[PDB]
């Protein structure tokens, strides 16, 4: 045939892949963690958004740390041969590098290690997307007026917030980041490469949201998400 390019992931496998959504709203009383009001809005928005991208969505609610590890290990041991990609969305409390099950924390590294190029062979060379709506610390942004491949290759971490910072969630509308992510996927998934979509998400979160609080410490604060890309190709959710 004629000249061929290979700058973009092959996304025309028989299936787009799994979208695992872990929605932790209620936490064991003994942890002292508050309920995450609004997160069901996020989980429903994500389910619909990724359904329209033709992902096989599985929603899981209120998982213990043990259930999270078991679920991710089980999913990584499925045969993904017919699947173009893998997506996991984590909605929970967190700290830098950590997501909370309902009864205690899980290292993000423990979850993502199941999908390493050498540990999940049917996803080797395919994009593995981890979308994380969780705090990465307690900083607040006060804003300003205006033959082998690496085992860590082909991961994308779409973090809701910058390293070290809180992440904002509205109890009525859902989290700033997930709200903006779904809106930008809905509007641009048939048009833009995924890094460009996530950049529009960054701009939407950065410009359209600002906290309102009766507590001066938490009032008038801002947020910027953080795209951490280890991908090796462009990612379009459509194919020719």
């Amino acid at each position: 045939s004629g000249i061929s390019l290979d700058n973009s992931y092959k996304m025309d496998y028989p299936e787009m892949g799994l979208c695992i959504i872990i929605n932790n709203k209620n936490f064991h009383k003994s942890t002292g963690m508050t309920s995450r009001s609004g997160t069901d809005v996020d989980a429903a928005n994500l389910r619909e958004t990724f359904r329209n991208l033709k992902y096989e969505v599985r929603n899981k609610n209120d998982l213990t740390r043990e259930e999270i590890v078991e679920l991710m290990r089980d999913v990584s041991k499925e045969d993904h041969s017919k699947r173009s990609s893998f997506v996991c969305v984590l909605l929970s409390h967190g700290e830098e590098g950590i997501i909370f099950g309902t009864n205690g924390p899980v290292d993000l590294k423990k979850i993502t290690n199941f999908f390493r190029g050498d540990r999940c062979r049917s996803l080797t060379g395919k994009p593995k997307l981890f979308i994380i709506q969780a705090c990465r610390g307690t900083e607040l942004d006060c804003g300003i007026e205006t033959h082998k491949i690496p085992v860590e290759a082909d991961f994308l971490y779409a973090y809701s917030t910058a390293p070290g910072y809180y992440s904002w969630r509205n109890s009525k509308d859902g989290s700033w980041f997930i709200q903006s992510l779904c809106a930008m996927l809905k509007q641009y998934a048939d048009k833009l490469e995924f890094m460009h979509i996530l950049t529009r998400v960054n701009r939407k979160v950065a410009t359209e949201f600002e906290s309102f609080s009766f507590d001066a410490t938490f009032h008038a604060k801002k947020q910027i998400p953080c795209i951490a890309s280890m991908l090796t190709k462009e990612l379009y959710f459509y194919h020719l």
């Binding site: 508050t34 995450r36 009001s37 609004g38 929970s92 409390h93 967190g94 709506q133 969780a134 705090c135 809701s160 809180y166 992440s167 904002w168 969630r169 509205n170 109890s171 989290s175 906290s211 309102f212 609080s213 938490f218």
Partner: peptide, 4 residues
Amino acid sequence: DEVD
């Protein structure tokens, strides 16, 4: 608005 709340933090996570």
